[PDB]
Design a protein around this motif. Structure first.
Motif, short mmCIF file in Angstrom:
data_model
loop_
_atom_site.label_atom_id
_atom_site.label_comp_id
_atom_site.label_asym_id
_atom_site.label_seq_id
_atom_site.Cartn_x
_atom_site.Cartn_y
_atom_site.Cartn_z
N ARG A 164 -3.06 3.69 -3.09
CA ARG A 164 -2.93 2.64 -4.08
C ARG A 164 -2.60 1.33 -3.40
O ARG A 164 -1.65 1.25 -2.62
CB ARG A 164 -1.86 2.98 -5.12
N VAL A 165 -3.40 0.30 -3.68
CA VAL A 165 -3.22 -1.03 -3.12
C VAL A 165 -2.74 -1.94 -4.24
O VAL A 165 -3.52 -2.27 -5.15
CB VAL A 165 -4.50 -1.56 -2.48
N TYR A 166 -1.47 -2.33 -4.20
CA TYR A 166 -0.88 -3.22 -5.19
C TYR A 166 -0.85 -4.62 -4.58
O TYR A 166 -0.02 -4.92 -3.72
CB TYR A 166 0.51 -2.75 -5.59
N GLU A 182 -9.53 2.76 -1.51
CA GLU A 182 -9.54 3.40 -2.82
C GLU A 182 -10.94 3.83 -3.23
O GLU A 182 -11.10 4.85 -3.91
CB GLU A 182 -8.95 2.46 -3.87
N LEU A 188 -6.33 8.58 -7.76
CA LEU A 188 -6.28 8.12 -6.38
C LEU A 188 -4.98 8.53 -5.70
O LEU A 188 -3.93 8.68 -6.33
CB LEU A 188 -6.41 6.60 -6.32
N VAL A 233 0.86 -1.18 0.00
CA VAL A 233 0.00 0.00 0.00
C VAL A 233 0.89 1.23 0.00
O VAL A 233 1.88 1.29 0.74
CB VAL A 233 -0.96 0.02 1.21
N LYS A 234 0.55 2.21 -0.83
CA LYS A 234 1.34 3.42 -0.98
C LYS A 234 0.43 4.64 -0.94
O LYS A 234 -0.72 4.59 -1.37
CB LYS A 234 2.15 3.41 -2.28
N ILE A 235 0.97 5.73 -0.40
CA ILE A 235 0.27 7.01 -0.33
C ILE A 235 1.05 8.03 -1.13
O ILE A 235 2.26 8.20 -0.92
CB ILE A 235 0.09 7.48 1.13
N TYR A 236 0.37 8.71 -2.05
CA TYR A 236 1.00 9.72 -2.89
C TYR A 236 0.65 11.11 -2.37
O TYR A 236 -0.38 11.31 -1.72
CB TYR A 236 0.56 9.55 -4.34
#
Ligand code: CLA
Ligand code: CLA
Ligand code: CLA
Ligand code: CLA
Ligand code: CLA
Ligand code: CLA
Ligand code: CLA
Ligand SMILES: CCCCCCCCCCCCCCCC(=O)OC[C@H](COP(=O)(O)OC[C@@H](O)CO)OC(=O)CCCCCCCCCCCCCCC
Ligand SMILES: CC1=C(/C=C/C(C)=C/C=C/C(C)=C/C=C/C=C(C)/C=C/C=C(C)/C=C/C2=C(C)CCCC2(C)C)C(C)(C)CCC1
Ligand SMILES: CC1=C(C/C=C(\C)CCC[C@H](C)CCC[C@H](C)CCCC(C)C)C(=O)c2ccccc2C1=O
Ligand SMILES: CC1=C(C/C=C(\C)CCC[C@H](C)CCC[C@H](C)CCCC(C)C)C(=O)c2ccccc2C1=O
Ligand code: SF4
Ligand code: SF4
Ligand code: SF4
Lengths: 73, 157, 73, 80, 42, 143, 73, 743
Positions: free
Chosen positions: D65-67, D54, D62, D4-7
């Motif tokens: 982001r859930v990879y 999301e 978004l 999981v990442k936050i931009y």
């Protein structure tokens, strides 16, 4: 033979349509502008933004095989 | 008064106590089956399980097989039962190879339903399961031989 | 079945089957070394497509050869 | 476990943290946006991949982001 | 009254009236000129 | 500075007859979870695993199989009733790990003692193409 | 009959795979900067034109070919 | 505490202002559409009243007026039926020769050659043969002239007007109160005695005055125009006494308890009348009298305002044992609060009742000359089977809806439901195992038989000639039924039905009506297939209901709603976890069950019953008794049933049955059309609509209502709707063509 050949044209055009739309929208779309980061084959992107089932290019191939079998049929 | 109670008094363990689960007749009968005799050499428990199943398997194969109406060779259909015992003895064998290692201890519970400490059943050990497969095979082929040994004065031979 | 029915139904069903095995005497002496789960969404699309294609090819190959070789003409 | 990442396009509405069903997201102080807060994913070991976060992000595109990555017992949602 | 006319302008009702008038017209055309695989008036 | 409360065993558990949705062998050999809350009175609450249970007055302890079951029950304890709650993880060794609320503050409320994890400082569309990370163990979002 | 059917289904699968690996190339290997403003990047630049017209041709063929068959039926 | 009439005055004003505002009922939909999805939601939530508001009173009044509207539409439908019987039909010709004339009540206009569908139906009539059976009903009731059908149609139109007006009245004017709806004791009392009791009594009064005498005159061969009018049997009782002598007394044995005299027109002879092929009308009138008395008595169980009677609350609370705790306590509060719970119960019971009707009407033909109209009988059976199956699936759906929306243990608790929820896992696992066992031990036998017949081993099959699996229990039961008249039923003159009693073959007009039905290995295999399919349908639906709130995968599923697509690709994948998708799959499985049921019915009737009888008593069935040997094989079902009996529908072109030939292929088309939706997902379609929108916006012709692909739930709904429509219409065309041609 005229009618069957136009069914053949329908099968070729639609199977081409599926594969080309998937190949061109494989790196991204208005719905998922970062599809290239998720790879070629992934389940989906979740129920958000309206629903994104069968949105990968692998799913485009998977849909086109039905049309391929129908065309060759 | 109610009949259904939580499993051993704990409601947050995924089970319940019912006449099918917790009853003196069921508890005693299961505690006296060879698979639940947690203090007996697994070779002997395998012998009993093998003898019972090898004896039972002969019936269906002989009465339903292809040679069933060709009475010249239909009685020898116990070979099919014996072959299944061989196959099952392989299934049993390959199971223990993957489940338990040579130096691994027992994976069976080391407790009792009343909380007291207990010696784990050696069946969940590599050598214990090996004895059970060897016992099941020996009793299995013996059960098939003994079942085929009888043939006459029965309403469905 | 793999193409119409989707995963979540079968995952909850497998959960009810895992409870059944752990609470059944005699059989609970046998432990699975890999946790039972429902087929992946992409795996389901692939398995459904493979059954579809295999049935497609085998059904037509059987009819084709039997209707032609039965007459041989 | 899933990544999981936050931009930095995040506006700090704390909606991804409210929708998360396994307490993976957090709200940390930041200086980039107006609410003085951004999201972070310090507990992706508990992340199941539901992408419920999301579905709640108002940013375009978004900011969560859930990879979906390597499956584990926690990520598969197994109680057994 | 104005609300009733606004209802008659909704998509399904306008579609039915329009397609009913269209269906009746094509039926009368094929009634006075049945069959006809071609444009015979040249 | 915050100090997480240690898990106190022998804490009362809600009144429940038992259900099939409880713990399994995963709790015995893998892990399980425990949620605790205070509550003002004896109430009825829907269980995230089965039917209904009677929430005891005063301290309550409830052991579940998954973490999501704990947070779901806690969220309902915070919505329907007005009850604060914590939950932990329990390994088969007996070790306990505090989970939520981590800071003692709820995660939706900003707290100054928190550090960034997995925060990329660019637009989401500014990730690189996958070819630029090929033959490396990297992903275009890990950076 | 068997030989013609065999090769046509073989060719149908091969064509689906050709477009599948075309999409896989766009995701895994396509570098947009090294293909700047050549014919390959221009395919992506007007992807909507290519996909929409493939859709029109499939719609045209499908509408009319089906319609004529139903009319004769 | 005192049952009484309670209404409110003018709660909702009558105006067209809300007509012109689409989506007025919903607060999010009323703002108009931003995208096209709006247009679909407006129809999906059109009848979801309990989601428009939370006030139970508004909901109940809306439901009341909706019932009135439905009754208006049903009365309009019946008006159309009777009017078509009067104006565009050959009923008077079918009345003189019921064995040769084909019943027809629809005549098409000659525009584009469709007049070919106006086929020769006899009696100098060109039309479409009807299978609804209205001719048999109108004959059983005693209708003779077109004038009586005209008057019945006019009365039905007047009643439709009355129902529509009452629907407007009890919502816009005098609209009832909540407690009025909740007076369950009074309502059940009036429905048992007032509705069913007095209804059965009224119909028995008609049957003893019109049906019996007019039908005696019709059986005797008297010309229908020369038959006295029905009311002439109410004035001069000499006419009624010349046919049934007991009418010369005048209600005196009824009051003096000499009812043994009325055995002339109130009999218990059973079986079929050999002249018409239907049940003895005297027996049916006696039946309706007994039903009237029983229901008039049963409508007194529940207390109202005079102390005497029961309170359902006490009866429920008193039924609790050691296994179920304080069971039934709380159910009275549940069933008086939740509309969806009542709807689930009533849908289940009404669907099962429709299935029971389908069986009872074929095995005991109630109307004259119905048993020989093979088209009408097959169509009635199949139609009622489908109605029942759909209604049961709806019962499942509304049970799940109640679970999601109206269930709350903190306010309206019930011990039985909580105990069921506390072991849903055991219940579902056991049903799963039963389904697997039945699937192996029914269909696996078919695969065994196919593989043995293909390998040249017909003695290693499961057959009446090889390994036999006789349904001994059903055979013994039908034998016990056969021997019941005169023993365990002394008043009965013949068997309950003809399928029981050995011998006693009834035939009408050269065709057989009924005869003893054989039961062999084929019947055994098919019955086990039916049990298995029913079990799998029950598994799907019940598993959806019990896991509607929570599961180990999603412990907060109830918050996601009753109808939601998924909960994300995580946890491995959570597609189709909602109870709605469980109903969605139960639809397919109910189809898969009912189709095998109706195919069993069709082949059995065409093989072992229906056929032609000789003058000397030689009966040759439509198919040469091929059911025992051919139906024990999947290849037999493919060849000796489908491939053989589809000939009529694939050969109907150029005849009056060509419409069935068109519907056959059209239903094939829509069935395959559903597969596009069922096999795909909306993301691809949205990405396609994106390029299409580009094309539109290039030419200044893109709509403001932004096009959006169907929702996931809508994708599945469209898929299952088209799948069901295609399959059922294909079977409909096939059945109708086959049975009208070979009938
Ligand atoms: C018999 C089944 C069936 C049918 C009829 C179709 C039809 C179609 N598919 Mg499809 N498909 C199917 C199965 C089917 N598919 C299956 C099983 C799969 C695998 C999942 C796919 C996957 C697939 C993909 C991936 C795509 C299509 C596409 C298309 C469209 C191509 C455009 C065209 O040819 O013009 C029209 C052809 C027709 C047959 C339309 C017939 C219907 C007409 C309009 C009836 C007229 C209405 C009339 C008034 C009736 C009144 C109805 C009343 C109730 C209102 C077309 C409508 C492509 C597309 O979207 O094109 C742009 C697309 O990309 N299909
Ligand atoms: C794209 C598919 C397609 C096409 C090209 C046609 C074409 C035709 N159909 Mg057909 N049809 C179709 C689909 C199609 N159909 C389908 C799917 C069905 C099943 C519902 C039918 C069912 C059908 C029937 C039942 C009949 C036809 C008939 C006809 C012919 C009549 C021409 C006419 O109406 O006179 C001329 C009409 C006009 C000139 C009207 C245009 C004038 C406008 C309104 C005003 C002009 C202002 C300036 C025509 C050649 C008829 C026929 O007899 O065939 C020979 C006929 O009876 N069709
Ligand atoms: C002997 C009294 C009586 C009778 C005959 C009926 C009959 C009926 N009721 Mg009813 N009901 C009654 C008493 C009665 N009710 C009482 C005391 C209560 C509680 C206060 C209810 C509460 C109730 C509810 C909540 C509902 C019904 C409904 C229905 C209809 C069910 C559908 C049907 O069976 O179709 C069969 C059709 C017929 C049998 C045609 C005959 C209809 C006649 C003309 C109606 C006459 C009965 C009426 C009660 C008399 C008053 C009307 C008068 C003031 C003009 C049906 C016509 C349902 C409904 O509304 O349907 C629209 C429904 O939702 N009833
Ligand atoms: C609601 C049903 C119903 C209705 C409306 C009627 C109505 C009627 N019956 Mg009847 N009846 C009924 C049920 C009914 N019956 C049943 C179920 C039986 C079987 C026990 C009878 C047996 C019966 C007999 C034997 C006679 C009547 C007669 C009559 C008529 C005499 C009325 C009178 O003038 O005083 C009347 C029109 C009498 C008659 O024919 O008068 C002309 C008469 O002789 N009825
Ligand atoms: C007395 C019976 C009854 C009643 C009163 C209800 C009432 C209700 N149902 Mg229900 N249901 C029933 C039976 C019933 N149902 C049965 C028998 C089934 C099994 C199929 C279902 C399965 C079902 C589901 C899965 C759902 C409901 C839902 C609902 C609610 C919303 C209805 C709505 O607005 O949909 C709107 C109606 C339409 C959009 C029309 C759709 C068009 C149909 C499906 C196809 C038409 C084909 C037609 C028959 C023939 C073709 C003609 C065509 C060519 C023109 C509502 C309170 C929904 C809900 O939200 O629950 C709260 C929900 O999702 N029902
Ligand atoms: C022809 C296609 C097909 C088949 C074969 C099945 C088969 C099955 N379905 Mg399914 N289904 C289908 C289509 C199909 N479905 C579709 C299209 C849908 C979408 C609506 C569904 C939706 C659905 C649901 C929702 C469910 C099922 C369930 C089941 C299982 C029921 C249990 C059973 O019968 O055990 C018996 C097995 C069979 C009858 C299959 C044939 C077995 C043969 C005869 C035995 C051969 C064994 C042989 C020795 C193999 C060894 C060979 C070796 C060399 C490899 C079963 C295996 C239910 C379930 O999970 O079970 C409880 C269930 O929940 N289905
Ligand atoms: C003013 C209405 C309008 C106009 C001018 C166009 C124009 C166009 N459309 Mg289109 N379309 C429309 C409505 C319209 N569309 C609607 C309502 C739908 C939903 C069914 C579609 C779905 C659609 C698809 C899937 C595609 C197009 C495509 C195209 C382009 C190629 C031509 C074609 O294939 O048309 C074909 C037209 C149809 C298939 C359906 C048309 C239905 C009627 C005839 C139009 C609506 C008229 C409107 C209701 C009248 C309003 C009256 C007003 C005065 C009150 C073209 C520029 C194709 C494209 O992408 O270009 C390459 C293509 O793939 N359209
Ligand atoms: C109906 C038959 C079931 C008999 C249940 C026997 C029975 O009625 O026992 C009755 C038993 C006792 O009920 P109580 O004494 O609590 O009843 C008091 C109140 O609840 C009722 O007013 O109920 C149960 O056993 C709980 C259900 C568990 C049993 C579940 C087994 C399900 C398997 C059934 C399927 C096999 C047979 C199929 C029939 C075709
Ligand atoms: C000589 C002659 C002639 C002429 C001819 C011609 C003119 C030719 C041709 C031809 C052609 C012209 C063909 C073709 C085909 C094609 C195809 C079939 C295609 C393809 C493509 C693809 C498949 C793609 C893929 C991809 C993608 C998608 C993206 C990425 C890249 C790639 C490339 C990988 C005639 C007959 C007149 C006469 C006789 C003689
Ligand atoms: C039945 C079903 C299952 C359950 C299926 C499971 C759990 C697979 C079970 C397979 C067993 C082990 C038997 C398979 C037999 C194979 C023929 C063996 C092949 C193995 C090698 C030869 C490759 C899903 O998980 C699923 C997921 C998503 C959409 C649809 C479905 C779905 O329809
Ligand atoms: C084809 C398809 C679509 C696309 C289907 C659509 C967009 C249906 C809508 C088509 C109609 C024809 C649009 C409505 C047109 C209006 C009635 C206006 C027309 C003007 C006059 C002719 C009436 C999905 O959205 C989908 C979603 C989920 C799973 C599978 C699928 C799927 O297979
Ligand atoms: S329903 Fe669609 S969005 Fe949801 S998990 Fe399945 S494929 Fe993904
Ligand atoms: S995918 Fe679900 S579990 Fe993972 S971070 Fe997002 S909301 Fe939390
Ligand atoms: S939902 Fe998006 S915008 Fe809102 S806090 Fe989370 S990352 Fe930021």
């Amino acid at each position: 033979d005229f009618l069957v050949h136009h069914a053949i044209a329908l099968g070729l055009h639609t199977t081409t349509l599926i594969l080309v739309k998937g190949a061109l929208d494989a790196r991204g779309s208005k719905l998922m502008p970062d599809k290239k980061d998720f790879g070629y084959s992934f389940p989906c992107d979740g129920p958000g933004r309206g629903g994104t089932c069968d949105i990968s290019a692998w799913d485009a191939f998977y849909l086109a095989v039905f049309w391929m079998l129908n065309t060759i049929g | 008064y109610q009949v259904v109670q939580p499993i051993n008094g704990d409601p947050f363990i995924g089970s319940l106590e019912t006449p099918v689960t917790s009853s003196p007749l069921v508890a005693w009968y299961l505690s006296n089956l060879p698979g639940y005799r947690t203090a007996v050499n697994p070779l002997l428990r395998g012998i009993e399980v093998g003898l019972a199943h090898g004896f039972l398997l002969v019936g269906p194969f002989v009465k339903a097989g292809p040679l069933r109406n060709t009475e010249i060779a239909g009685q020898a259909g116990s070979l099919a039962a014996g072959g299944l015992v061989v196959i099952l003895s392989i299934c049993l064998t390959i199971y223990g190879i993957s489940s338990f290692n040579e130096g691994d201890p027992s994976t069976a519970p080391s407790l009792t339903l009343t909380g007291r400490k207990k010696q784990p059943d050696q069946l969940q050990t590599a050598d214990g399961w090996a004895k059970f497969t060897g016992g099941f095979f020996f009793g299995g082929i013996s059960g098939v031989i003994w079942a085929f040994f009888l043939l006459y004065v029965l309403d469905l031979p | 079945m793999f193409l119409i029915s989707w995963r979540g139904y079968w995952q909850e069903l497998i959960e009810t089957l895992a409870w059944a095995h752990e609470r059944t005497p005699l059989a609970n002496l046998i432990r699975w070394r890999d946790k039972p789960v429902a087929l992946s969404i992409v795996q389901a699309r692939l398995v459904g497509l493979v059954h579809f294609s295999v049935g497609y090819i085998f059904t037509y190959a059987a009819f084709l050869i039997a209707s032609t070789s039965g007459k041989f003409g | 476990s899933h990544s999981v990442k936050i931009y930095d396009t995040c506006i700090g509405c704390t909606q991804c943290v409210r929708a998360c069903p396994t307490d993976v997201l957090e709200m940390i102080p930041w200086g980039g946006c107006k609410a003085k807060q951004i999201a972070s994913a310090p507990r992706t070991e508990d992340c199941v991949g539901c992408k419920r976060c999301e579905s709640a992000c108002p940013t375009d595109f978004l900011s969560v982001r859930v990879y979906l990555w390597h499956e584990t017992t926690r990520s598969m949602g197994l109680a057994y | 009254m104005r609300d009733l006319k606004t209802y008659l302008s909704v998509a399904p009702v306008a579609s039915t009236l329009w397609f009913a008038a269209l269906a009746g017209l094509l039926i009368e055309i094929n009634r006075f000129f049945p069959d006809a695989l071609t444009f015979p008036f040249f | 500075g915050f100090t997480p409360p240690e898990l106190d065993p022998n804490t009362p558990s809600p009144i429940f007859g038992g259900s099939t949705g409880g713990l399994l062998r995963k709790a015995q050999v893998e892990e399980f979870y425990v949620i605790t809350w205070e509550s003002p009175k004896e109430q009825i609450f829907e269980m995230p695993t089965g039917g209904a249970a009677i929430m005891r007055e005063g301290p309550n302890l409830l052991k579940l199989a998954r973490k999501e079951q704990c947070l779901a029950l806690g969220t309902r304890l915070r919505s329907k009733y007005k009850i604060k709650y914590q939950f932990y993880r329990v390994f088969p060794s007996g070790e306990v790990q505090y989970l939520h609320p981590k800071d003692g503050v709820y995660p939706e409320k900003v707290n100054p003692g928190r550090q960034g994890v997995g925060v990329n400082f660019r637009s989401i569309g500014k990730n690189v193409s996958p070819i630029e990370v090929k033959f490396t163990g990297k992903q275009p979002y890990d950076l | 009959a068997a030989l013609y059917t065999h090769h046509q289904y073989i060719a149908g699968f091969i064509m689906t795979g050709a477009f599948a690996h075309g999409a896989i190339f766009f995701i895994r290997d396509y570098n947009p900067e090294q293909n700047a403003d050549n014919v390959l990047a221009r395919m992506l630049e007007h992807k909507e034109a290519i996909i929409s017209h493939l859709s029109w041709a499939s719609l045209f063929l499908g509408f009319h070919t089906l319609g004529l068959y139903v009319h004769n039926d | 505490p005192e049952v009484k009439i309670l209404v409110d005055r003018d709660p909702i004003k009558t105006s067209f202002e809300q007509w012109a505002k689409p989506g007025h009922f919903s607060r999010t939909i009323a703002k108009g559409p931003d995208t096209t999805t709006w247009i679909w939601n407006l129809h999906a939530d059109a009848h979801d009243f309990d989601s428009h508001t939370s006030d139970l009173e508004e909901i109940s009044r809306k439901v009341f007026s909706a019932h009135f509207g439905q009754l208006s539409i049903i009365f309009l439908w019946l008006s159309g039926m009777y009017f078509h019987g009067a104006r565009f039909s050959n009923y008077e010709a079918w009345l003189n020769d019921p064995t040769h004339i084909r019943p027809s009540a629809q005549v098409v206009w000659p525009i584009v050659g469709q007049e070919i569908l106006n086929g020769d139906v006899g009696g100098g009539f060109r039309g479409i043969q009807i299978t609804s059976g209205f001719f048999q009903i109108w004959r059983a009731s005693g209708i003779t002239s077109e004038l009586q059908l005209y008057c019945t149609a006019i009365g039905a139109l007047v009643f439709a007007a009355l129902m529509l007006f009452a629907g407007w009245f009890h919502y816009h004017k005098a609209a009832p109160k909540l407690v009025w709806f909740q007076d369950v004791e009074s309502m059940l009392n009036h429905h048992l005695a007032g509705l069913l009791g007095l209804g059965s009594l009224s119909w028995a009064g008609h049957q003893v005055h019109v049906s019996l005498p007019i039908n005696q005159f019709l059986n005797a061969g008297v010309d229908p125009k020369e038959i006295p009018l029905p009311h002439e049997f109410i004035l001069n009782r000499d006419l009624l006494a010349q046919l049934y002598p007991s009418f010369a007394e005048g209600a005196t044995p009824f009051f003096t308890l000499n009812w043994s005299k009325y055995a002339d027109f109130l009999t218990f002879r059973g079986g079929l009348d050999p002249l018409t092929g239907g049940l003895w009308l005297t027996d049916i009138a006696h039946h309706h009298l007994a039903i009237a008395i029983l229901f008039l008595i049963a409508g007194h169980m529940y207390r109202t305002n005079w102390g005497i009677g029961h309170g359902i609350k006490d009866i429920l609370e008193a039924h609790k044992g050691p296994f179920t705790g304080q069971g039934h306590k709380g159910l009275y509060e549940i069933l008086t609060t939740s509309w969806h719970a009542q709807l689930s119960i009533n849908l289940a019971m009404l669907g099962s009742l429709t299935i029971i009707v389908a069986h009872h009407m074929y095995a005991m033909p109630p109307y004259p000359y119905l048993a020989t109209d093979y088209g009408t009988q097959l169509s009635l059976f199949t139609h009622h089977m489908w109605i029942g199956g759909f209604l049961i699936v709806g019962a499942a759906a509304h049970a799940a809806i109640f679970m999601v929306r109206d269930y709350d243990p903190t306010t309206r608790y019930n011990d039985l439901l909580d105990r069921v929820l506390r072991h849903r896992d055991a219940i579902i696992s056991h049903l799963n195992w039963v389904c697997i066992f039945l699937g192996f031990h029914s269909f696996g036998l078919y695969i065994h038989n196919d593989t043995m017949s293909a390998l040249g081993r017909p003695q290693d099959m499961f057959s009446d000639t090889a390994i036999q699996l006789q349904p001994v229990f059903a055979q013994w039961i039908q034998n016990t039924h056969a021997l019941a008249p005169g023993t365990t039923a002394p008043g009965a003159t013949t068997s309950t039905s003809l399928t029981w009693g050995g011998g006693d073959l009834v035939s009408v007009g050269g065709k057989v009506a009924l005869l003893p039905i054989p039961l062999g290995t084929a019947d055994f295999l098919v019955h086990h297939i039916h049990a298995f399919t029913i079990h799998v349908t029950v598994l799907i639906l019940l598993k959806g209901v019990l896991f509607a709130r929570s599961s180990r995968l999603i412990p907060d599923k109830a918050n996601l709603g009753f109808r939601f697509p998924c909960d994300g690709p995580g946890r491995g994948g959570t597609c189709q976890v909602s109870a709605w998708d469980h109903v969605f799959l139960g639809l397919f499985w109910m189809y898969n069950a009912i189709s095998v049921v109706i195919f069993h019915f069709s082949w059995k009737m065409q093989s072992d019953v229906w056929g032609s009888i000789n003058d000397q008593g030689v009966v040759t069935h439509i198919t040469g008794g091929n059911f025992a040997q051919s139906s024990i094989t999947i290849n037999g079902w493919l060849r000796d049933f489908l491939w053989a009996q589809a000939s009529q529908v694939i050969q109907s072109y150029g005849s009056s049955l060509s419409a069935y030939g068109l519907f056959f292929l059209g239903a094939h088309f829509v069935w395959a059309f559903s597969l596009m939706f069922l096999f795909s997902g909306r993301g691809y379609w949205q990405e396609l609509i994106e390029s299409i929108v580009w094309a539109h916006n290039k030419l200044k012709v893109a709509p403001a209502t932004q096009p959006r692909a169907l929702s996931i739930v809508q994708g599945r709904a469209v898929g299952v709707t088209h799948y069901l429509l295609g399959g059922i219409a294909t079977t409909w065309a096939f059945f109708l063509a086959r049975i009208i041609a070979v009938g």
